[PDB]
């Protein structure tokens with residue numbers, strides 16, 4: 176297939192990374208994942224805006240402008256003939272002799288973007304999944320979608336080893352987000368979720384779900400809940416570009432209510448479907 | 453020059469790093485830095501031991517025996533004709549289709565190592581340097597020498613912009629370590645430094661210095677100190693494989709005692725010199 180390398184579209188086999196790329200020695204870079212539906216990129220405007228925002232947050236000046244980035248992403252999908260799956264793209268500070276501080280003389284940021292055929296998680300959306308609680312031991316700037324993902328790797332692995340789809344992270348019993356998703360709780364027709372500060376990534380799917388709730392007039396309270404409160408919620412689910420609205424029916428053997436997908440989770444999924452390309 | 457690639461010492465241009473190498477997408481890997489004095493490696497076995505420990509802490513099993521790794525670093529120094537400088541070496545989980553969890557079928561870890569001619573910091577060792585306090589926002593597994601270093605990058609950059617050599621990190625007003633070093637304080641002839649827990653990296657230079665204090669009959673207390681306490685110390689210095697024992701004479705414009713290198717730091721520098729190749 177074809178990969179976006181910097182501002183070029185090249186054959187997969189041509190791409191090689193320098194050992195001194197700061198993304199390889201420091202994880203000094205940011206990234207995005209965009210879902211594609213029948214050749215249509217879902218909320219690509221929001222994902223590109225966040226890529227540039229994450230970049231600005233760690234002072235990386237992406238070498239070309241947004242308009243040029245969208246154009247390159249558009250041809251990447253067409254070149255790979257991607258129907259349904261996702262586009263992954265990242266940008267690092269660039270390659271230069273190893274040193275912690277920013278390169279004295281502005282080097283050019285490295286860009287990588289590729290595609291992958293992958294259907295929607297229909298079985299999970301319908302049936303729900305099992306989750307597990309895992310202590311959030313990550314850094315304090317979770318609002319930046321950076322390449323420093325070692326914490327999430329170890330957490331995801333733990334969940335998979337227990338046959339769970341996701342690891343629900345918590346800071347001293349307070350639920351923050353999932354290893355690669357945002358977490359939502361429902362009690363008495365009210366939608367709860369951790370506020371969007373430095374403790375979580377302000378997900379694009381999270382924002383679309385909150386928009387859906389406002390459209391159907393469901394009360395939304397952006398305040399955190401503990402692991403114990405989460406266990407006594409009427410409904411529970413996780414959100415991500417690839418997971419959409421995935422219901423959580425069980426946490427560590429403990430059923431969320433009756434272990435069935437809830438009413439509001441269904442209403443929310445229904446409204447989310449109206450947004451799909 | 454020549455680069456260590458897994459178990460072969462090839463030319464820099466013959467190395468191929470994949471875009472899906474986990475050290476590039478998740479910072480899923482560990483590393484080390486070894487100082488070379490006149491073609492001789494300093495505390496190489498201690499660093500190799502830590503590399504393996506760091507690796508196993510995140511479930512990565514380096515394929516070679518520690519003695520084979522030592523022999524590989526030795527060949528690298530000779531092929532490059534390195535006199536005084538350092539060797540940088542790392543290992544990632546390897547290349548596999550992007551996913552947070554560990555690769556289902558164990559792929560081979562990727563090893564990369566190279567040299568760099570760099571003199572001893574003569575001026576800093578004798579005159580001392582300026583430092584600046586910066587809040588520690590890093591993750592909770594600082595005992596693992598991983599590639600997740602975005603926190604340290606931002607901290608070091610803040611130090612340099614202020615004309616400072618190092619950023620002295622602090623959590624809850626308690627000094628932990630520097631962005632790329634360990635921090636020591638002296639008062640009333642006692643040597644203090646934060647204990648080796650998950651909040652810091654148990655430095656190799658740190659251990660040698662503590663061993664030096666023992667040898668010169670100086671009391672050591674591995675207890676943490678606040679920024680307020682750090683400013684009241686009689687003497688203060690940072691340690692690292694590249695910085696050796698670099699005295700800190702001023703923090704945020706506030707002098708440490710009289711702004712000059714202390715006697716105990718000098719005694720430690722003298723004993724440390726007896727260990728050098």
Ligand SMILES: Cc1ncc(COP(=O)(O)O)c(CN[C@H](C)C(=O)O)c1O
Nearest residue numbers: 208354355356357376378379380415416
């Ligand atoms: C920690 C974390 N929180 C929340 C999200 C969801 O954000 P969004 O709705 O914009 O995708 C993700 C997953 N992002 C991508 C999918 C990943 O790492 O694969 C994440 O890494």
Ligand SMILES: Cc1ncc(COP(=O)(O)O)c(CN[C@H](C)C(=O)O)c1O
Nearest residue numbers: 485631632633634653655656657692693
């Ligand atoms: C966070 C941190 N603490 C402490 C140390 C000192 O450990 P040692 O004395 O074994 O080098 C370092 C430096 N490591 C290397 C030098 C680096 O990243 O360049 C470090 O990155």
